[PDB]
Amino acid sequence: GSADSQIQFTRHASDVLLNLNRLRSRDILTDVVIVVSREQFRAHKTVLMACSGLFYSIFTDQLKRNLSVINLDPEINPEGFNILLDFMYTSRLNLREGNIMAVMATAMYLQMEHVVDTCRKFIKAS
Amino acid sequence: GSADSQIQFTRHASDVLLNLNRLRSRDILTDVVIVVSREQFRAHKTVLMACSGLFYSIFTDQLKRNLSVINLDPEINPEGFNILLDFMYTSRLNLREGNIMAVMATAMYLQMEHVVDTCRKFIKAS
Ligand SMILES: Cc1ncccc1[C@H]1C[C@@H](c2cccc3nc(N)ccc23)Nc2c(F)cnn21
Ligand SMILES: Cc1ncccc1[C@H]1C[C@@H](c2cccc3nc(N)ccc23)Nc2c(F)cnn21
């Protein structure tokens, strides 16, 4: 007789993230700039919040919710922040011997606990 | 010697989407209301654009970019729109014998071509 069905699209989340990275490339509906000393990164707050305890805290603070510019701590590496923003929008964490420690430091500052734990493994591997 | 590594987080996209659905539940950084005759659905424009040709077109139109309210065609089923918004934020398409045709109609209105094609299969299955 009658048949209700819940259908799982396994590629859906990945497709969403590709499309979110494409909006970011074309600067579509980006609503915040992240300033890392001399560098700037345009992003969507919702993606930052979804990926970072720190951005979650900032944009859930009802004062800071509407900020269009966020200045990161002077100590934060721009190259490392860039790697972690790419990771947020692609699921791909790109590590070099040269940056791994800066990436891990930035991940911890950003409260990206799973990225930090993966950084720990790469360190031992090398 | 030196070892660069690009690491794939297979669960990352799914985790992002869970967190995006949680922001929507708690109405955090939602920036549009979709009015379907008598009903309203708060959402994030970036997720709509990522999932729907129609919302892609609307929010890329530089006039309509900043709209906080979108009125859908009077003919559109609210129950069907709700199913497709849940699908956008969860990857799960929930179909009943009663709504499948309305879901497919709404998917096509929204330019969600992969959802329409899956609706076609369910129709034959039942
Ligand atoms: C509070 C909560 N409960 C259940 C599920 C999810 C959440 C939080 C988690 C938060 C988030 C992400 C990634 C690393 C995080 N690390 C920390 N130390 C803190 C928050 C972190 N991001 C997010 C959203 F965009 C929506 N909800 N949440
Ligand atoms: C233009 C383009 N080229 C390559 C890759 C992606 C895109 C478009 C596709 C568009 C979108 C989604 C889902 C069904 C769509 N159906 C239609 N008929 C039209 C657009 C549809 N959504 C989206 C973003 F949020 C960012 N980019 N894009």
Author numbering:
A (entry chain A), B (entry chain A): 3 to 128
Publication passage describing the model:
B-cell lymphoma 6 (BCL6) is a transcriptional repressor that accomplishes its effects through binding of specific DNA recognition sequences by the C-terminal zinc fingers, whereas corepressors BCL6 co-repressor, nuclear receptor co-repressor 1, and silencing mediator for retinoid or thyroid hormone receptor (SMRT) bind to the N-terminal BTB–POZ (BR-C, ttk, and bab for BTB; pox virus and zinc finger for POZ) domain and, in turn, recruit histone deacetylases. B-cell lymphoma 6 (BCL6) is a zinc finger transcriptional repressor possessing a BTB–POZ (BR-C, ttk, and bab for BTB; pox virus and zinc finger for POZ) domain, which is required for homodimerization and association with corepressors. BCL6 has multiple roles in normal immunity, autoimmunity, and some types of lymphoma. The corepressor binding groove in the BTB–POZ domain is a potential target for small compound-mediated therapy.
The crystal structure of GSK137, in complex with the BCL6 BTB–POZ domain (residues 5–129) bearing changes Cys8Gln, Cys67Arg, and Cys84Asn to improve solubility of the protein, was obtained in order to explore the structure–activity relationship of BCL6 binding. The 2.04 Å resolution crystal structure was generated from an apo BCL6 BTB–POZ domain crystal soaked with the compound. There was clear electron density for the ligand allowing the binding mode and absolute stereochemistry ([R]-chiral center at C6 and [S] at C8) to be determined. The compound binds in the lateral grooves in an equivalent manner on both sides of the interface utilizing the same key interactions with both protein chains of the BTB–POZ domain homodimer. Key interactions are observed between the three principal moieties of the compound and the homodimeric protein at both binding sites: (i) The aminoquinoline moiety is partially surface exposed but makes dual hydrogen bonds to the side chain of Glu115 residue and packs against a miniloop from Cys53 to Gly55, between two small helices of one monomer (monomer A in Fig. 1, B and C). (ii) The pyrazolo-tetrahydropyrimidine core lies deeper in the binding pocket, pi stacking against the aromatic side chain of Tyr58 and hydrogen bonding to Met51 main chain carbonyl, of monomer A, and Arg24 side chain of monomer B. Arg24 also hydrogen bonds to the Tyr58 hydroxyl (of monomer A) to further stabilize the complex. (iii) The methylpyridine moiety is also solvent exposed like the aminoquinoline but is clearly stabilized through pi stacking against the Arg24 guanidinium group. An overlay of the BCL6 BTB domain–GSK137 complex with the BCL6 BTB domain–SMRT corepressor BCL6-binding domain peptide complex shows that GSK137 binds at the same lateral groove as the BCL6-binding domain of a known BCL6 corepressor and demonstrates the mechanism by which the compound could block corepressor binding. GSK137 displaced peptides derived from the human SMRT co-repressor from the BCL6 BTB-POZ domain in a TR-FRET assay with a pIC50 of 8.
